[PDB]
Amino acid sequence: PELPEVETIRRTLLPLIVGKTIEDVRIFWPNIIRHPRDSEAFAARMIGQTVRGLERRGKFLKFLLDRDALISHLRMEGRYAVASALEPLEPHTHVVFCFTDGSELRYRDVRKFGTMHVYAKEEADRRPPLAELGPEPLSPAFSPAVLAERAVKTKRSVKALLLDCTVVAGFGNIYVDESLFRAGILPGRPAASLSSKEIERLHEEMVATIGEAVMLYVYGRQGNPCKRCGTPIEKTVVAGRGTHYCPRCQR
DNA sequence: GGTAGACTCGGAC
DNA sequence: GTCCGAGTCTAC
Ligand SMILES: [Zn+2]
């Protein structure tokens, strides 16, 4: 799921788990657990804690318990569900949090690719994976000035810059390509080559693109006409990623 | 100390 | 058998 979908998960999951107390934690793929590194310690420490809140940072979910925070990343295909302990698990279920009321929070992923870290709440923001995370794209902390300062300091492409979690939190490949199209900027442009005007426009389109999604021109549209000018959309590799752009609209 | 490479995984190709 | 996404860790 991308950032907007993670926000939807945050908002929908919270009422389904708030105030429930963890009775057991069952782990079927220990490698998902990144901290404590021992999955048995991860399970043991969560037992007895009640779920108090659920926040989002970038694409991370932060489950707030009594003492601890569980920080979860679903990557491309991870999913959460709340269901009865009496019913069979869905395929590819890797971690289950069992509550005292006979319900469960289940994490599944066909790709078996996500991560979980647990720390004392007061520590979570200063440990991986949250440490160093950049500002929320929809926050005033993500400003044209912040974007410009990062851009002038790097030799990297503008796409690489936007994909950098330290620059802006959880702005995915799809929204990078869409935002750059809407701003009229080629993804392979050196970040330092952008004018103040281009930076301002880019920031504006990033906020609009992700704001609209929480409330496609190019992504996956290679070979099809641009919706704005009719030129075939192209796909190349930029910053190690599939990259979609209109070679007329973007400069 | 900025930046690229290694590392996870399995469905699609 | 290879490709590919995110984000952390490793190493230059
Ligand atoms: Zn176009």
A36 noted as active-site residue: no
Do A122 and A234 share a domain, yes or no?
no
Residue A27 pairs with which residues in a beta bridge?
A95
A123 and A3 assigned to the same domain: yes
Whether residues A40 and A107 share a domain: the answer is: yes
Q: Are A162 and A202 within one domain?
A: yes
Residue at which a domain ends, from A132, A162, A189: A132
* Phi, psi (deg, nearest 5) at residue A65: -110, -160
Q: Helices (DSSP H) in chain A: which residue ranges?
A: 3-17, 39-46, 121-124, 144-152, 158-163, 173-183, 196-214
Q: What distance in Å separates the CA atoms of residue A34 and residue A196, rounded to the nearest whole number? A: 41
Q: What residues contact A12, with CB distance under 8 A and at least 6 apart?
A: none
Same domain, A111 and A69: yes
Catalytic residue among A1, A36, A128, A135: A1
Q: Which letter, b or e, does each residue of A172-188 get, where b requires 16 or more Cβ atoms within 10 Å of its Cβ?
A: bbbbbbbbbbbbbbbbb
Residues A237 and A243: beta-carbon distance below 8 Å: yes
Which two structure tokens, joined as six digits, stand for A95?
């971690």
Tell me which residue range forms the domain holding A227.
133-251
The CATH number linked to A201 is: 1.10.8.50
Residue A191: burial class (beta carbons within 10 Å; 0-12, 13-18, 19+): buried
**CA separation for the pair A125, A122 (Å, rounded):** 7
Distance CA A81, CA A105 (A): 6
- Name the residue with tokens 């005007």: A197
Place of tokens 């870290």: A117
Is the same domain home to A171 and A212? yes
Cα(A135)–Cα(A138) distance, integer angstroms? 8
Choose among A44, A71, A204: nearest CA to A133: A71
Q: What are phi and psi of A17, to 5 degrees?
A: -130, -20
- In the set A20, A56, A57, A59, the catalytic residue is A59
**Type of residue at A101:** D
CATH number at residue A25: 3.20.190.10
Q: Helix A3-17 crosses helix A196-214 at what angle (to 10 degrees)? A: 40
Strands A234-238 and A115-120: unpaired
What is d(CA A12, CA A68) in angstroms, rounded to the nearest whole number? Answer: 21
The rounded Å distance from CA A232 to ligand 1 centre is 8
Q: Which neighbouring-strand residues pair with A241?
A: A238
* Protein CB footprint (7 Å) on chain C nucleotides: 4-9
Annotation marks residue A26 as catalytic? no
Resolution of the model in angstroms: 1.6
Residues A81 and A138 grouped into a single domain: no
Domain count, chain A: 2
With both helix axes pointing from N to C terminus, report the angle between A144-152 and A196-214 in degrees, rounded to the nearest 10: 120
- Taking the C1' atom of every nucleotide in all shown strands and the CA of A160, the nearest one is B3
For residues A204 and A159, state if they share a domain: yes
Q: Which of A34, A67, A121, A241 is catalytic?
A: A241
- Distance from chain centroid for Cα A193: 28
Contact status, residue A151 vs residue A191, Cβ threshold 8 Å:
yes
Single out the residue in A132, A151, A186 at which a domain terminates.
A132
Report long-range pairs for A151-155 (Cβ below 8 Å, ≥24 apart): A151/A191, A151/A192, A151/A194, A151/A199, A152/A191, A152/A192, A153/A192, A154/A191, A154/A192, A155/A190, A155/A192
Look up tokens 């750059």; give the residue.
Answer: A180
Terminal C-alpha separation, chain A: 30
Closest by CA to A130, choosing from A62, A189, A40, is A62
What kind of experiment solved this structure?
X-ray
- Pair (A86, A50) in one structural domain: yes
A197 is a catalytic site residue: no
> Angle at which helices A173-183 and A196-214 pack, to 10 degrees?
130
* A3 and A122 together in one domain: yes
Say if residue A126 is in the same domain as residue A150.
Answer: no
Residue A221 shares a structural domain with residue A118? no
A226 annotated as ligand-binding: yes
Map tokens 């690489």 to a residue. A160
Q: Which of A107, A132, A157 is the last residue of a domain?
A: A132
Token couple for A82: 């709340």
